[PDB]
Each structure stands twice: as structure tokens, then as C-alpha cells.
Amino acid sequence: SGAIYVGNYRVVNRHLATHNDWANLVWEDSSRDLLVSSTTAQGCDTIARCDCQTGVYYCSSRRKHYPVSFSKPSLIFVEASEYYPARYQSHLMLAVGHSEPGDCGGILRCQHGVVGIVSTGGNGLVGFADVRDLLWLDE
Ligand SMILES: NC(=O)[C@H]1CCCN(C(=O)Cc2cccc3cn[nH]c23)C1
Ligand SMILES: [Zn+2]
């Protein structure tokens, strides 16, 4: 579990979004596993605007932060789950690191701020949904 709070927005994994999230929907994209809802309080997270390929992510299944090298956002195949059929997830970045299904929502950060959130994983890999291209999160 976990979300990004920036301005009047909450960013969460689309497969974990609540009734409140959908009742206050701003934007959602099933192909990115992202959903953004509105909030009645200010968000003080800073979104990075960069092409960093190194950072640190929070891993709830280990109660620890891990440094990672990650790939550039791209279309990557993802197995069927209960939330989605087999498909290509776009704007996805992979890293070598530990992750388990309940790790989704853990933030990936670089020196510039928030990069994305855990969305996929398995086999010693962790996948992050990128948020650096969503320039509207700031205005
Ligand atoms: N974005 C999706 O379509 C996902 C929806 C939930 C299921 N899913 C996974 O990847 C499950 C999984 C296994 C093993 C480590 C991890 C870490 N996070 N998620 C992990 C696919
Ligand atoms: Zn950066």
C-alpha cells in the first residue's frame, strides 16, 4: 500500500484505488496502473522532473529502503492478476530488487524528488509506475 500527495492530488496504484478515490476521480489509466483523485488538504511531496536512472525505493515487505538502478519508462508485458488481464503496462521502469505484491504504493525517489510508485515485481525484479511525465500534478 501507499500513495503520493502533491498539491490537491493523491496518486495511487489504480488496482488499489478506494471508493473515495473513484468518487473524486481526476484521471486514471489502466495501461499505467495509475489513478489520481482530489483531496481536501495540501500535498507536500515534490515530483522529480528528470531522466534519473538511480534512486531509493521503500520496500514494506522488508521495512527498509533500497538503492536501485532502474530502466527508462517503457511498455512491458505483465501477467493476468484479478485486477487486469495479460497486457503491456506502459511507463513502467524495472530494477533488480526485492518486492512482494503488498509492496505496491512504495515510493521511488531520486535527489530531485518522487519518481514513481511500486506497481509490479517478481523473480528478483521490482517495477515502478513512472509519474515524472505528469506535469499537470504541479499546476
Ligand atoms: N501492475 C499490475 O498489473 C500488478 C497488479 C497486482 C498484481 N501484480 C503483480 O505484479 C504482483 C506482484 C508479485 C510479486 C511482487 C510484486 C510487487 N508488486 N506487485 C507484485 C501485477
Ligand atoms: Zn532525478
Short mmCIF file of C-alpha atoms in Angstrom, two decimals, residues 9-116:
data_model
loop_
_atom_site.label_atom_id
_atom_site.label_comp_id
_atom_site.label_asym_id
_atom_site.label_seq_id
_atom_site.Cartn_x
_atom_site.Cartn_y
_atom_site.Cartn_z
CA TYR A 9 -3.87 15.34 -5.59
CA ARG A 10 -3.49 11.79 -4.29
CA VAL A 11 -1.69 9.39 -6.69
CA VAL A 12 -2.25 5.65 -6.02
CA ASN A 13 -2.00 2.29 -7.89
CA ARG A 14 -5.25 2.06 -9.92
CA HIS A 15 -5.80 -1.58 -8.77
CA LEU A 16 -5.71 -0.43 -5.11
CA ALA A 17 -7.89 2.75 -5.51
CA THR A 18 -10.76 3.13 -2.94
CA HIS A 19 -14.47 4.19 -3.34
CA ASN A 20 -13.44 7.76 -2.30
CA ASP A 21 -10.68 7.82 -4.97
CA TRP A 22 -13.21 6.88 -7.70
CA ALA A 23 -15.84 9.30 -6.29
CA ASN A 24 -13.20 12.11 -6.51
CA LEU A 25 -11.52 10.87 -9.77
CA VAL A 26 -9.31 13.39 -11.69
CA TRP A 27 -7.63 10.92 -14.15
CA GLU A 28 -6.97 7.15 -14.42
CA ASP A 29 -5.06 4.98 -16.88
CA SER A 30 -5.45 1.19 -16.68
CA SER A 31 -2.44 0.72 -19.00
CA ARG A 32 -0.19 2.58 -16.45
CA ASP A 33 -1.93 1.13 -13.30
CA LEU A 34 -2.37 4.80 -12.12
CA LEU A 35 -5.27 6.73 -10.66
CA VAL A 36 -5.26 10.31 -9.37
CA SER A 37 -8.01 11.60 -7.04
CA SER A 38 -8.68 15.02 -5.47
CA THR A 39 -8.06 15.81 -1.76
CA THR A 40 -9.25 18.49 0.75
CA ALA A 41 -5.71 19.15 2.09
CA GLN A 42 -2.33 20.19 0.63
CA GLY A 43 0.25 17.68 -0.50
CA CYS A 44 3.86 18.46 0.17
CA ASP A 45 5.53 15.76 -1.98
CA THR A 46 7.84 17.08 -4.67
CA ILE A 47 7.68 15.37 -8.06
CA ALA A 48 11.01 14.97 -9.85
CA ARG A 49 11.28 16.28 -13.40
CA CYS A 50 14.29 14.39 -14.74
CA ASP A 51 15.73 11.32 -16.57
CA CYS A 52 17.46 9.80 -13.45
CA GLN A 53 18.10 6.08 -13.59
CA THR A 54 19.20 5.73 -9.93
CA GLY A 55 17.23 6.24 -6.74
CA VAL A 56 15.92 4.69 -3.49
CA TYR A 57 12.59 2.85 -3.02
CA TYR A 58 10.68 1.88 0.14
CA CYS A 59 10.07 -1.91 0.49
CA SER A 60 7.27 -2.57 3.02
CA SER A 61 7.89 -6.38 2.99
CA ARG A 62 11.37 -5.68 4.47
CA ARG A 63 10.64 -2.36 6.40
CA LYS A 64 13.69 -0.99 4.53
CA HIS A 65 14.76 1.43 1.80
CA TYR A 66 16.96 0.06 -1.02
CA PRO A 67 19.14 1.92 -3.56
CA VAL A 68 18.45 0.82 -7.20
CA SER A 69 19.47 1.40 -10.81
CA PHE A 70 16.26 1.36 -12.91
CA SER A 71 15.40 1.30 -16.63
CA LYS A 72 13.79 4.09 -18.73
CA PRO A 73 9.93 4.14 -18.78
CA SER A 74 8.63 1.69 -21.39
CA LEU A 75 5.92 -0.88 -22.39
CA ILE A 76 6.47 -4.14 -20.51
CA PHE A 77 4.40 -7.40 -20.52
CA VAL A 78 2.51 -8.12 -17.20
CA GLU A 79 0.71 -11.42 -16.29
CA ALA A 80 -3.05 -11.64 -15.53
CA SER A 81 -3.89 -10.96 -11.85
CA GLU A 82 -7.56 -10.43 -10.71
CA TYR A 83 -7.29 -6.64 -11.35
CA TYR A 84 -6.14 -6.98 -15.04
CA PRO A 85 -5.93 -9.43 -17.99
CA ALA A 86 -2.46 -10.24 -19.55
CA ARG A 87 -1.23 -6.95 -21.20
CA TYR A 88 1.60 -4.43 -21.81
CA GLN A 89 1.87 -1.86 -18.99
CA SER A 90 3.23 1.46 -20.26
CA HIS A 91 5.54 4.00 -18.47
CA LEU A 92 7.00 1.12 -16.42
CA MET A 93 10.60 1.02 -15.08
CA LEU A 94 12.33 -2.15 -13.81
CA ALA A 95 15.09 -2.60 -11.20
CA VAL A 96 16.83 -5.58 -9.60
CA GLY A 97 15.49 -5.71 -6.06
CA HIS A 98 13.14 -7.39 -3.64
CA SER A 99 9.36 -6.89 -3.90
CA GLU A 100 6.12 -8.71 -2.95
CA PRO A 101 2.51 -7.88 -4.03
CA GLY A 102 1.72 -5.79 -0.91
CA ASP A 103 4.77 -3.59 -1.75
CA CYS A 104 2.74 -1.66 -4.41
CA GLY A 105 2.50 2.04 -3.48
CA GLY A 106 6.05 2.21 -2.07
CA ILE A 107 7.72 5.37 -3.35
CA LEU A 108 10.81 5.51 -5.59
CA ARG A 109 12.76 8.79 -5.08
CA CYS A 110 15.90 10.36 -6.58
CA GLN A 111 17.73 13.58 -5.45
CA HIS A 112 15.07 15.62 -7.37
CA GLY A 113 12.05 14.12 -5.56
CA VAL A 114 9.37 11.47 -6.17
CA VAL A 115 9.94 9.36 -9.37
CA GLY A 116 7.13 6.77 -9.13
#
